[PDB]
Amino acid sequence: SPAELMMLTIGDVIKQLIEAHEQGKDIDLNKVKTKTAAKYGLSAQPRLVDIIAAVPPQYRKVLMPKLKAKPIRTASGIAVVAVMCKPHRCPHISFTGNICVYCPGGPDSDFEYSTQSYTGYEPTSMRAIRARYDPFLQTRHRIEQLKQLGHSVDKVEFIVMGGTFMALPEEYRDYFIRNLHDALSGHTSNNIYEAVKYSERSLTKCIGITIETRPDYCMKRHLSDMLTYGCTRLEIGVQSVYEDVARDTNRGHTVKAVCESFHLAKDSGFKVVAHMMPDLPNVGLERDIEQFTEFFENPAFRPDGLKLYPTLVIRGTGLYELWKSGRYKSYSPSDLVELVARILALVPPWTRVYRVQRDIPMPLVSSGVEHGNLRELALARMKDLGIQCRDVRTREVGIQEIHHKVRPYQVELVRRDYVANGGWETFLSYEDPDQDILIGLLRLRKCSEETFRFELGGGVSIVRELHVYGSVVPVSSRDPTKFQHQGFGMLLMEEAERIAREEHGSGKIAVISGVGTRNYYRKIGYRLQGPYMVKMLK
Amino acid sequence: MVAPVLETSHVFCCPNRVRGVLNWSSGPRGLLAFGTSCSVVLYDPLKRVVVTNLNGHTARVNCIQWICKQDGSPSTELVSGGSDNQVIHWEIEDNQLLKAVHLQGHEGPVYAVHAVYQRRTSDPALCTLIVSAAADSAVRLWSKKGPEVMCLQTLNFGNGFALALCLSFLPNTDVPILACGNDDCRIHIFAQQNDQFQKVLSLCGHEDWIRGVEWAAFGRDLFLASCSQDCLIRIWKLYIFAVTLETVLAGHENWVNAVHWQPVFYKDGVLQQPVRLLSASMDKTMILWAPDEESGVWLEQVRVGEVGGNTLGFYDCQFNEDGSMIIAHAFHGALHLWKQNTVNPREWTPEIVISGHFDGVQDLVWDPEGEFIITVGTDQTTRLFAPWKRKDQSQVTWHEIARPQIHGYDLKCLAMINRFQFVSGADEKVLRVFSAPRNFVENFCAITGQSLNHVLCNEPPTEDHLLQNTLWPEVQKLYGHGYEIFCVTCNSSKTLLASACKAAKKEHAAIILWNTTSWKQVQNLVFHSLTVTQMAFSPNEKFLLAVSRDRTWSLWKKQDTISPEFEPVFSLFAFTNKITSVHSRIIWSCDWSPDSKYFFTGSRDKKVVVWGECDSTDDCIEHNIGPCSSVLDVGGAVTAVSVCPVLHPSQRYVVAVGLECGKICLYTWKKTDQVPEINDWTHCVETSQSQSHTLAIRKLCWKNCSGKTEQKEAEGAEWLHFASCGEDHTVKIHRVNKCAL
Amino acid sequence: MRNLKLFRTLEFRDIQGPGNPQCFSLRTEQGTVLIGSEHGLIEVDPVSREVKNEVSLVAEGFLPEDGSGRIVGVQDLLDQESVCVATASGDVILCSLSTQQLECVGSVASGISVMSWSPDQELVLLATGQQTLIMMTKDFEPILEQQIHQESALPWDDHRPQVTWRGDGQFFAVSVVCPETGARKVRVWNREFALQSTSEPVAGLGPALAWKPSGSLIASTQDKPNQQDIVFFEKNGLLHGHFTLPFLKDEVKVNDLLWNADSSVLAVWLEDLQREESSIPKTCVQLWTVGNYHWYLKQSLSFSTCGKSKIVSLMWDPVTPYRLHVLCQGWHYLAYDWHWTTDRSVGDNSSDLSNVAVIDGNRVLVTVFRQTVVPPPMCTYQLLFPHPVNQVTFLAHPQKSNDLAVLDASNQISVYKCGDCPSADPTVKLGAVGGSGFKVCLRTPHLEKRYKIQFENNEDQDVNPLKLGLLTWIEEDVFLAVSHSEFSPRSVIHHLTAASSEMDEEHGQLNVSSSAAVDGVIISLCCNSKTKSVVLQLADGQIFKYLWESPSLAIKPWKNSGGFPVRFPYPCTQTELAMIGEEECVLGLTDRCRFFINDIEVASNITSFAVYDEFLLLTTHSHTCQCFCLRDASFKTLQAGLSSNHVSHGEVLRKVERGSRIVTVVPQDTKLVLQMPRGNLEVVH
RNA sequence: GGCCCCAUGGUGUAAUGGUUAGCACUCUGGACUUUGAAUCCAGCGAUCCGAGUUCAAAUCUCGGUGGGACCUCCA
Ligand SMILES: [Mg+2]
Ligand SMILES: [Mg+2]
């Protein structure tokens, strides 16, 4: 077949890319394919992945920057790896009888071999099913795909997905945690502690893990279990801020439990991401806008993250009968886009929005969403109405380089202060004032008088996150065009130390680090006192 | 003799998960040594039958290394390791465990061991030198100066670790040398001077963890294989004593896990000194590097590799005594071997090896005719073991020939329905039933030698035919149970099936009966309050029992049938409350004597109660059911009880009682027919540390050879063959002499 | 955070009326107030003390002459000159004015209880005495009539229905004591009588009801075991929070609740119960507010309960943002005006620590911004007082600009002062910077004196709860306050000198040692920090210089550069004084975003500004802050720089977010504190 | 060797001097911290090669390059 000539095409195309590089002249890529594709008799332009595939070692090293496919996987600062666990029943079906109304799929649903809330057809689902829910295989597959695309996986970030992660026995959970840490590091451990200790000295650094949970399985014991695992971020389903809704939907808990979980998690040192759920089947539009104004105004709900989710009706669920019988009529697309525009206008300047729309395919959804591009339509309507969206997901350096073209020219130190679920927090950042471009951030806090961890008692200020945005520069590398190794972290630590020892009036500064980042803090002057990095400031 | 003997016939197992657990001794008829669960297994590839086992460890075994004989004789000593923080030295002779020394003092599981016969001139009889690197951020140096052991030295690598070690001797002398790599992307050389190991030099090599080092003394020169993790092998040299860097040969694309020089060998008196190199990596390939004939630069020779499914590469590989074969240990647990084709050295052909589940085997079923066994375990796999004929030759071998299910759930139970039918209780709410294709029966005819027309009533495969080209088709699917299945058992008539599921209330702890022909629920029997742990049907096919976690049982007797086509009904004839119960804790086993009127029970209270008395079947008017004789106290939590399916002259009732630790014990019982209820039980034969497991025992199923109703052809009619479905990955089959009448 | 301040009170007494007041309303375009008595309508003008129109309903056989009959309510009607009135006998009359024409426009058999006119007057709602509700069009053409009636009742509930409209007039809510359950119940309808919702069963519901103007929460009150709280319903009918009044159990009654013109300030009316045999009762009008969902208490006013002080009705001004009208029983008229501000300390740069004092009723939440930049709901330290606080101010001495002076309702001027030894007095409690282990090195003030104000003779003060406003602590011993004389526009400036020489005894005496008289209403007073010269703004906005150090207490008009009088084109709320090179200027700002250096407008889009030691900082309405120097700049230089047409560059301009308001300035750190409408803080350079 | 016809994006054909090119397969980018291959929306890309006639030609004359067709010499 001419496809055999196709690899000659690559065999020619590579022969060009290095050749010009030998004499150091940049060569255009689209037109070189076009030219050395009509001479060998091709009927399809080459795909970049096959070009990246067959390259000699040093030539791969020198042509990765000019042959990077989808330059957003490393434009945020980490490498996302999504894994799931075994199908299991949610832990409020015993004393209630039925799981939440709107949940699609699950172990006892009509979708065969379906994880809870993740029916059968999201990409992570086919990634995990063929591995039969084996963490080793899944993480290796994701890493090898990310290396196929031509990215650097030197900094990894795990996300466990599925149902709830606490309704499982101890053996299965520790099996997951050790397998993940060993897969990233290369060891073969027996318990969690050995896995963590070898992961600490590993080369491919780990940054942390994110777990989803219900607020009723978020207590002191569970927080201890997380802090042993190395987790550094937690997500709680906070559907609706109204008590009537959270009882009429068989949610199984109350808002007060959610507020208490917020208090405990933020006092311990985590970062919490809420799952709000517009268009619940009793609420309405003005009620939505009021509940979101309350959620971003009440100093008992202010998170450091958000993940919106418009309602979708799916067969074999509680909402399906209500829709069929003549209740819970949906929203028209225009008013939905208007509403989403209003929320994104209300979003505060320190909350990062991750996801706006569900990944559910068109044939599955019976009603509720037409275009799987709601964020861009919402932003267009913002620029239509004159209002502005000013979160950090649309102001970090990486995003506003692929979008637009401008780059920071003058950097300044902005500081914000707040009142969280009962603690006093600060927010330091280096960013461009005149252009609204963010670079790096920090999150201090003064622990309240309801802490339950021994290390944080007696005059302790905690740091929950450090993150400098840009492009993923591997460890010990130095590049003068990216931003991740220019020296902002040292200045942020200096100012955080000054704040914690002069304004907070504290005695200990503690950092909830990951595992691969631990060595980093050892060059600052910190120590280890458990799952924390402490330092005497006096 | 008067006291019958117990012997273990067959063992099936495989290496565990860990890197470095493999070795061949350098000598004729060298013995392969690997590690399964918490034991070391010696097996000869040529015999294709396991040699023996060397128990004594407690945790998972990590690394095993032989100690070669300098002359070239088969090795004697065998240094081991484990995750129980102790290093065990072994001494073998005539395939029997001679000596075992428990060296201890490690605060952390060991990962690297290396030793060699030291050659001091002050008549140091069998003076060795053991080195062990563990998870204690330190390495220890030992010595077995005869029948005594003492720790020589301890070196701590700060908060780092140690990953590879080897000992050798400097040229023109006998000064010890030690190559110790670490996670510091670096290897160190320590030479023993004065009387303490010192620091000599610090090489700057790769940029990843070193997953192996190896010395090679050729002529008067030293060559150091320095395998790495960043796809880079690096050969060094050491000459009179500075070290120099040499060829940096590469060609792998993933982590490279092992490297081993081909060892010297004696061919017709003259020793041979080959210069080659074998390695394995995650990339699912093996590269055999040899230098060019004219130029000294190293080049690839062969690219032997495995293509099955989408599994990963290999953790270890071993070459041979001289050059004949090659073995590699896969990821999921597998052994791939290849011998060099005489016509083409670059050509290599597969062979036959052993296998087994890589997790605890939960259940086992013997074939009704008695020629294959089906085993199911937590490894989410079902394996069928059958014999083979090695042409006109003795020592018939049983080994894997099929793999009906590679299902993705955690299977827990098993049941036969017919000659080729299959029911598996997974970790879901559905019972899945299987049938057999014609390829299986055709291959079974081709292998076992039984005629095709006879098997249908008118070489064994390798890793490729089983993992990819073997799957028994599913025929139906049974719903109805609201929770995961926990106990499955059929009846001897292959008509009624019974199932039980995990439960926490009375409604969920109800057993369900199904018809074989029309697969619909015959009846639902409700009793107890927790999950029914064990169940089986009566040999005369009119009783039932449901000993469960609630420390009770059930006696669901059969009711008379008026209409022939009507499905039979069951009624509760006897029961037991907390007061009537004699067991102190959870019950986990049951079996009936094949006398239709007595049965056994086994709990976790270390007591075996033989309460039967289910006689006078025709005139069973009231309940006269209770304890039958004295309660035996073996001394451990009994997990499985079974009764041999044949009766014996002096009213003998022989039972194979297991325990928590593998302690398969044969007991013999008879009612005293008098108010003295002592000495009714007698003890026949125990099991030693060579015929027993190292972990739990799950099912001691016997062999009921219904094909041999009468002993047609026998070698004396004195043997009984039974199974031990253990938890330490072993499916060992035992043979026991019974009697002589 | 900011707090309210009283700056204008208008009191007109003894209106010549035949009977006694029963209801009243306003005519905002004319500024005249209508008062429906038990005899006939009366039209009054408070700024001139006259009664122009006086209709006699009794004469024209409408109001019975026996001495009874209730006017349901006087309602002014827009784009006209007539008034729509009602009578408890069950009639609605469209009585005109001037021409004295009185025509019967509606008659119903059963009597009428309450009249409710929507914020736009095209649909009116009436409630009958037969327990039915009539919806009428603007021209009194009938539209519809539907019945209201589709643990026990509170004892002093008078069974009087109240009706509330939304701000936009789309929905309304009816409060009725349900005969079945004998409990308060709320029903919500839309414009065309669609039954929107019914309230949830709640025990102990009060009688009050006031839908929020913008509209998300319906105010009400509930008496729970051991407390009395104000609860907020929503349109659906369910409770969505509450807040607790600071009073004992079963002691005070809540009369009614009413909202501001922009859903900002909520006024609650409280009356003391006569449970004790004597139980000398008290009247409370309390002005609260909302911050970070924590309800501050900013003002508390105390009348006399019985006698010639019976408070008959209150009305928030529907047009003017912060203006409250009070009608007493003895034909008495009161008008109160307020405006927002914040209290901050300015002093020598080497020693001054910038401070913020925020009122929360009986506490003061001080925050020192030089060391601990603290969010609003938290504070550095906290001062506690026995009875609610009204006015708070800082000392104006250049080297001592950290000594607070807190005034309270019962007229007890405390003097909290910072010293070497903290003295460990319990009145100063650590805020968010104290606790076990947590400790920051700072010095907290300690109480020094509890001066008691003395007034001339032993008169009964007045029915006015407040007699002093705009207290200024110009010197450690000498204070300043201003009062308005009722009859003449003559305003009086007092001198509350320290009669007590030193720390002789607690409960010292402050004596009025002087009283200067200057014609015209005074709306604001300020003083210089270095020269300590005092500037007054008369009602017109004219700027008069005042000399307290002068024995004659002479008041001279402020002279501009050319020695001419200075007059603001408009009344100026916030005023400060600056030292611009070699001239002193009366910097000022209006409610309509105007800057008024001397008398010349130099901007038209300013939201908030602040002047510190040669540093003028401004927040334009274009979301762009600015900062100008004053060390060597000139009036022309500032005019040209702030001309708004000179090109803006990066050295001065610095963008901010939407609605940022400057809080304070930190010079030595060169830092600025901004508060957004959400509530948080931001620091820039 | 004349003879008659043809050449358009990588590929398939559209379009008669206001000159100044649209559709399909294919490729690339964003929604996406659940995805190179799915959905939606945007985008990169052509009139082989010369002289010219007409103010002006993917459109007309002549060329010479490639392809197709009739009688071809030729070996
Ligand atoms: Mg074409
Ligand atoms: Mg793509």
Identify whether residues C220 and C281 lie together within a single domain.
yes
Identify whether residues B324 and B438 lie together within a single domain.
no
Q: Per the CB < 8 Å rule, is A188 touching B19?
A: yes
8-state DSSP, A478: -
The CB-based long-range contact list for C667-673 (8 Å cut-off, 24+ gap) reads: C667/C349, C667/C612, C667/C613, C667/C615, C668/C349, C668/C370, C669/C370, C672/C617, C672/C625, C672/C627, C673/C369, C673/C373
Per the structure block, which two tokens stand in for C483? 């009062």
Per the structure block, which two tokens stand in for A286? 């003005």
| Residues in B lying within 8 Å of A, measured between beta carbons | 17-19, 59-60, 83, 109, 135, 159-161, 183, 208-209, 229, 255, 310, 312, 380, 408, 428-429
User: Using a CB-CB distance cutoff of 8 angstroms, which residues of chain B are in contact with residue A194?
Assistant: 109, 135
Domain count, chain C: 5
Shortest Cα–Cα distance, A535 to chain C (Å): 15
User: Using a CB-CB distance cutoff of 8 angstroms, which residues of chain B are in contact with residue A133?
Assistant: 408
Q: Are A181 and A102 in contact (CB under 8 A)?
A: no
Residue B621 resides in a domain: no
Q: Per the CB < 8 Å rule, is B18 touching A188?
A: yes
* Alpha carbon separation from C658 to A414, C149, C293 (Å, rounded): 16, 48, 20
Cα B207 from chain centre:
38
Q: Are A489 and A440 in contact (CB under 8 A)?
A: yes
Give dist(CA B298, CA C375) in Å, integer: 71
Q: Per the CB < 8 Å rule, is A188 touching B17?
A: yes
Burial of residue C56 (number of CB atoms within 10 Å: 0-12, 13-18, 19+): middle
DSSP assignment of B594-627, as one string? TTSS-EEEEESSSEEE--------TT--S-----
Give dist(CA C367, CA C390) in Å, integer: 18
Strand order of the β-sheet with C171-178 is C162-165, C171-178, C183-190, C195-198
Return all residues near B631 (Cβ < 8 A) that are at least 6 apart. B582, B607, B608, B609
Residue B676 resides in a domain: no
8-state DSSP, A168: S
Please report, as a single letter, which amino acid is at residue B450. Answer: Q
Identify whether residues C430 and C518 lie together within a single domain.
no
A180 assigned ligand-binding residue: no
Give dist(CA C484, CA C569) in Å, integer: 23
Identify whether residues C42 and C18 lie together within a single domain.
yes
From the CB of residue B88, how many other CB atoms can be counted at a distance below 10 Å? 21
Span CA (A148) to C1' (D21), Å: 40
Domain that holds residue B453: 357-391+404-479
Using a threshold of 3 CB pairs under 8 A, tell whether chains B and C touch: no
List the one residue out of C581, C550, C585, C589 whose CA is nearest residue C566.
C585
Identify whether residues C116 and C248 lie together within a single domain.
no
Q: Are C433 and C371 in contact (CB under 8 A)?
A: no
Span CA (A4) to C1' (D65), Å: 29
Q: By the CB < 8 Å criterion, does A494 face chain C? A: no
* Alpha carbon separation from A531 to A182, A202, A489, B414, B616 (Å, rounded): 19, 17, 21, 45, 69
Final residue of a structural domain among C102, C131, C160: C131
CA angle, B77 then B80 then B85, to 5°: 145
The sign one gets for the Cα dihedral A260, A262, A263, A268 is positive
Q: Are B132 and B149 in contact (CB under 8 A)?
A: no
Q: By the CB < 8 Å criterion, does A275 face chain C? A: no
Query: B interface mutation test: which of A136, A140, A175, A188 has the most B CBs within 10 A?
Result: A188
Give dist(CA C134, CA C146) in Å, integer: 7
Give dist(CA A256, CA A270) in Å, integer: 19
Residue B175 resides in a domain: no
What are the backbone angles phi and psi of residue B710, rounded to the nearest 5°? -120, 145
List the one residue out of A15, A250, A60, A272 whose CA is nearest residue A150.
A60
Quote the ligand 2 centre to A69 CA distance (angstroms). Answer: 9
Please report, as a single letter, which amino acid is at residue C347. Answer: G
A490 assigned ligand-binding residue: yes
Strand partners, C580: C583
Q: Per the CB < 8 Å rule, is B160 touching A198?
A: no
Per the structure block, which two tokens stand in for B520? 């619909």
8-state DSSP, A396: B
Q: Are C480 and C533 in contact (CB under 8 A)?
A: no
Identify whether residues B332 and B369 lie together within a single domain.
no
Identify whether residues B318 and B300 lie together within a single domain.
yes
Give dist(CA B670, CA B665) in Å, integer: 17
Quote the ligand 2 centre to A354 CA distance (angstroms). Answer: 20
Burial of residue C542 (number of CB atoms within 10 Å: 0-12, 13-18, 19+): middle
Q: Per the CB < 8 Å rule, is A132 touching B312?
A: no
Residue C83 resides in a domain: yes
3-state secondary structure of A294: helix
Query: Half-sphere exposure of residue A228, counting CA atoms within 13 Å on the CB side?
Result: 14
Residues in chain A: 538
3-state secondary structure of B221: strand
Give dist(CA C437, CA C676) in Å, integer: 33
List the one residue out of B735, B714, B741, B717 whose CA is nearest residue B650.
B741
Identify whether residues C224 and C273 lie together within a single domain.
yes
Per the structure block, which two tokens stand in for B24? 């061949």
Please report, as a single letter, which amino acid is at residue A153. Answer: V
Return all residues near A234 (Cβ < 8 A) that are at least 6 apart. A210, A211, A212, A213, A218, A226, A265, A270, A271, A272, A273
Identify whether residues C283 and C154 lie together within a single domain.
yes
Residues in chain C: 685
Quote the ligand 2 centre to A50 CA distance (angstroms). Answer: 14
Give dist(CA A234, CA A222) in Å, integer: 12
Give dist(CA C350, CA B473) in Å, integer: 90
8-state DSSP, B466: H
Residues in chain B: 741
Nearest ligand, measured from the Cα of A43: 1
Closest chain A residue by Cα to residue C678: A297
Span CA (C481) to C1' (D33), Å: 62
Beta strand ranges found along C539-670 (DSSP E)? 543-546, 555-557, 574-580, 583-589, 606-612, 615-620, 624-629, 654-655, 661-666
The CA-based dihedral angle spanning residues A266, A268, A272, A274, taken in that order and rounded to the nearest 10 degrees:
-70
Per the structure block, which two tokens stand in for A97? 């009888």
From the CB of residue B535, how many other CB atoms can be counted at a distance below 10 Å? 20
Quote the ligand 2 centre to A381 CA distance (angstroms). Answer: 26
Residue B51 resides in a domain: no
- Provide the H-helix boundaries in C41-108: none
Residue C394 resides in a domain: yes
Domain that holds residue C490: 454-558
Identify whether residues C363 and C487 lie together within a single domain.
no
Please report the number of interchain residue pairs, chain A to chain C, with beta-carbon separation below 8 angstroms. Answer: 92
Q: Are B474 and B433 in contact (CB under 8 A)?
A: yes
Across all strands, nucleotide nearest A50 (CA–C1'): D36
What's A1-41 look like in SS3? Answer: CHHHHHHHHHHHHHHHHHHHHHHCCCCCCHHHHHHHHHCCC
Looking at domain A403-522, does it have CATH number 3.40.50?
A: no
Residue B418 resides in a domain: yes
List the one residue out of A480, A483, A445, A515 whose CA is nearest residue A200.
A515
Q: Per the CB < 8 Å rule, is A434 touching C650?
A: yes
Residue B80 resides in a domain: no
Q: Are A124 and A118 in contact (CB under 8 A)?
A: yes
Identify whether residues B414 and B372 lie together within a single domain.
yes
Give dist(CA B582, CA B577) in Å, integer: 10
Using a threshold of 3 CB pairs under 8 A, tell whether chains A and B touch: yes
DSSP assignment of B420-462, as one string? T-EEEE-SSS-EEEE---HHHHHHHHHHH---HHHHTT-----
Give dist(CA B711, CA B715) in Å, integer: 10
A6 assigned ligand-binding residue: no
CA angle, C436 then C441 then C445, to 5°: 100
Touching B: which chains, 3+ CB pairs < 8 A?
A: A
Cβ density class B132-158: b for 16+ within 10 Å, e for less: bbbbbbbbbbbbbbeeebeeeeebebe
* Alpha carbon separation from C379 to B159, C355, C552 (Å, rounded): 46, 11, 44
Q: Per the CB < 8 Å rule, is C375 touching A460?
A: no
Q: Please report, for the domain that includes residue C216, its CATH number.
A: 2.130.10.120
3-state secondary structure of A340: helix
Identify whether residues C267 and C393 lie together within a single domain.
no
Identify whether residues B312 and B361 lie together within a single domain.
no
What crossing angle do the helices spanning A170-185 and A135-148 adopt, rounded to 10°? 30
Query: A interface mutation test: which of B60, B106, B253, B409 has the most A CBs within 10 A?
Result: B409
Span CA (A42) to C1' (D24), Å: 18
Return all residues near A40 (Cβ < 8 A) that are at least 6 apart. A2, A5, A8, A9, A12
8-state DSSP, C639: H
Residue in the block written with tokens 């020192």: C368
Cα C146 from chain centre:
39
Cα A489 from chain centre:
21
Burial of residue C19 (number of CB atoms within 10 Å: 0-12, 13-18, 19+): middle
Residue B255 resides in a domain: no
Nearest ligand, measured from the Cα of A38: 1
* The pairing of beta strand C332-341 with beta strand C323-328: antiparallel
Strand order of the β-sheet with C311-316 is C3-13, C332-341, C323-328, C311-316
List the one residue out of A178, A135, A164, A146 whose CA is nearest residue A80.
A146
List the one residue out of B313, B251, B236 whose CA is nearest residue B280.
B313
Q: What is the CA radius of gyration of chain C?
A: 27
In chain C, residues preceding a discontinuity (C to N beyond 2.5 A) are 150
DSSP assignment of B100-142, as one string? EEEEE--SS-EEEEEE-----SS--TT---EEEEESSSEEEE-
Domain count, chain B: 2
* Alpha carbon separation from B129 to B82, B146, B225 (Å, rounded): 18, 11, 21
CA angle, A260 then A266 then A272, to 5°: 90
Give dist(CA C165, CA C167) in Å, integer: 7
Identify whether residues C469 and C395 lie together within a single domain.
no
A488 assigned ligand-binding residue: yes
Q: Are C481 and C496 in contact (CB under 8 A)?
A: yes
Span CA (A36) to C1' (D74), Å: 39
List the one residue out of B619, B679, B623, B631 whose CA is nearest residue B657.
B631
Give dist(CA B733, CA B399) in Å, integer: 12
Final residue of a structural domain among C131, C166, C182: C131
Please report, as a single letter, which amino acid is at residue B431. Answer: L
Q: Please report, for the domain that includes residue C611, its CATH number.
A: 2.40.128
Identify whether residues C119 and C175 lie together within a single domain.
no
Per the structure block, which two tokens stand in for A229? 């695992």
3-state secondary structure of A217: helix
* Alpha carbon separation from B322 to B267, B271, C382 (Å, rounded): 9, 11, 88
Residue C490 resides in a domain: yes
Residue C408 resides in a domain: no
Q: Are A439 and A399 in contact (CB under 8 A)?
A: no
Span CA (A20) to C1' (D49), Å: 28
Q: Please report, for the domain that includes residue C105, its CATH number.
A: 2.130.10.10
- Provide the H-helix boundaries in A357-487: 374-385, 399-402
**Strand D positions within 7 A of protein Cβ atoms:** 9-11, 25-41, 44-45
Span CA (B352) to C1' (D2), Å: 78
Give dist(CA B522, CA B567) in Å, integer: 7
8-state DSSP, C559: B
Strand partners, C253: C271
Closest chain C residue by Cα to residue A427: C682
List the one residue out of C156, C145, C233, C123 whose CA is nearest residue C187.
C233
Identify whether residues B316 and B378 lie together within a single domain.
no
Residue C142 resides in a domain: no
